Write a protein that binds this ligand. Structure first.
Ligand SMILES: O=C(O)c1ccc(Nc2c(-c3ccccc3O)nc3ccccn23)cc1C(=O)O
Length: 437
């Protein structure tokens, strides 16, 4: 397969549903490269657990933890890392209120080259245990020979775009990694980078990040087809922000408008949002504790009940993962019969203005609060007009492995979105327990 899109291993499904899945220990294995040093970008870290995931022979190599924690949370992270003298930390600046460092990425420098891993899992045991999570594995990028002047750039501009993403941190530890990336050949990369970084972007910079970055790539590198108004948009996420009092405030006015872009020319497009119901969580492998990783607060939800009419259940028979709650985030543009897709994005970005950006100043500036990162699969980058949808996730190679079932199934009238901070004491979970926050 050209796509190198993987799911994490799920403990408790039959082996056929883990054939071709990856655990973190597989990613860090010596079979992937002889590790010299690494950078782990993430939100949440269990450092003791993380070090145990590296092969014993590599556990003393330098590790950089890139995080967004402040104040007492920052002190707790430093205390976790203090026993390991090979671990350094980089605090990503979050100068806009209510932002988060969400990006999940590994930079893996080897004796043999460099690898980039963009994924969806926090660096804690539970995120790799019984959840549906996504991973993109870059090729092994070789080093450019000393004295050789070449760009090492791909047709998708991934090298310059990754360097631009890292430059936004303005961090000395990341300038070191920028210099590493400069020295490697990333030309084989077939995905486009879609990042978010905190700021207020206008003019030339408006298209660099968030939903305007997606819109720009779709304008420039996808083509519109006849009956494009009938091709739905699907968004699938683990958390929901405050979107406003009605769908015209943001969801259907700027977010959907960016997602429905195709090609360079001048809406009734269906919008499917996939988010676990209470029943999905209750009957999951983890039970109600899975909802600890589905942060949707009652304070947010009660202001936007209009949104829940867009919600569809989590179902993943195709990958044996209907009971493995999603922490992956994906967005895509299927055909009206869901047999093809015009593009697919795996990302850290949830359904929130903080992650994707919100227009300000009479539509002239895009304001983003958080760091996010994902990779976009466009048919044109593979010499194709569209991707066929792979019927069975683990079963030509030009078919794209969509990890959940299509078409998405609407919530039933008795279903409710998972809301993490209210009790569920009416039916017990798969471990015999209720949920009492
Ligand atoms: O992707 C996801 O679903 C995700 C969602 C939220 C998140 N952080 C977070 C948490 C929080 C606090 C403690 C324990 C878990 C939590 O979620 N509370 C807020 C409040 C506002 C903004 C962010 N908040 C991190 C991730 C992630 O996995 O990176």
């Amino acid at each position: 397969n050209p796509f190198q899109f993987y799911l994490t291993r799920v403990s408790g499904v039959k082996p056929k549903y883990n054939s071709g899945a990856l655990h973190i220990k597989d990613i860090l294995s010596p079979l992937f490269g002889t590790l010299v040093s690494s950078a782990q970008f993430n939100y949440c870290f269990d450092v003791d657990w993380l070090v145990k995931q590296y092969p014993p022979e590599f556990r003393k190599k330098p590790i950089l933890l890139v995080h967004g924690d402040k104040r007492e949370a920052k002190a707790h992270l430093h205390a976790q890392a203090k026993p390991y003298e090979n671990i350094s930390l980089c605090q990503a600046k979050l100068d806009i209120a209510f932002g988060t460092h969400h990006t999940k990425m590994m930079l893996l420098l080897y004796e043999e080259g460099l690898r980039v891993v963009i994924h969806t899992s926090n660096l804690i045991h539970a995120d790799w245990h019984q959840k549906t999570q996504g991973i993109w594995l870059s090729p092994l990028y070789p080093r450019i020979a000393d004295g050789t002047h070449k760009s090492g750039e791909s047709p998708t501009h991934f090298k310059a775009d990754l360097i631009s993403y890292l430059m936004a941190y303005n961090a000395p530890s990341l300038k070191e990694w920028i210099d590493v990336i400069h020295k490697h050949d990333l030309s084989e990369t077939n995905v486009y980078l879609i990042g978010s970084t905190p700021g207020r972007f206008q003019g030339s910079q408006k298209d660099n990040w968030g939903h305007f970055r997606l819109k720009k790539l779709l304008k420039d590198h996808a083509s519109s087809m006849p009956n494009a108004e009938s091709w739905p948009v699907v968004g699938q996420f683990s958390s929901v922000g405050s979107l406003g009092a009605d769908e015209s405030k943001w969801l259907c006015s700027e977010f959907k408008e960016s997602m429905l872009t195709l090609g360079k020319e001048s809406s009734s497009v269906p919008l499917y949002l996939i988010y676990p119901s209470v029943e999905n969580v209750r009957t999951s492998l983890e039970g109600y504790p899975a909802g600890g990783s589905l942060p949707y607060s009652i304070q947010t939800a009660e202001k936007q009940n209009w949104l829940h009419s867009y919600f569809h259940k989590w179902s993943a028979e195709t990958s044996g993962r209907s009971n493995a709650m999603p922490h992956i985030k994906t967005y895509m543009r299927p055909s009206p019969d869901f047999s093809k897709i015009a593009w697919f994005l795996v990302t850290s970005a949830n359904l929130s203005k903080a992650a994707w950006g919100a227009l300000e100043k009479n539509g002239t500036q895009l304001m983003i609060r958080s760091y996010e990162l994902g990779v976009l699969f466009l048919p044109s980058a593979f010499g194709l007009d569209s991707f066929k949808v792979k019927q069975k996730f683990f079963a030509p190679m030009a078919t794209f492995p969509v990890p959940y079932d299509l078409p998405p199934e609407l919530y039933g009238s008795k279903d409710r979105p998972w809301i993490w901070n209210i009790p569920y004491v009416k039916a017990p979970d798969t471990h015999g327990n209720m949920w009492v926050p």
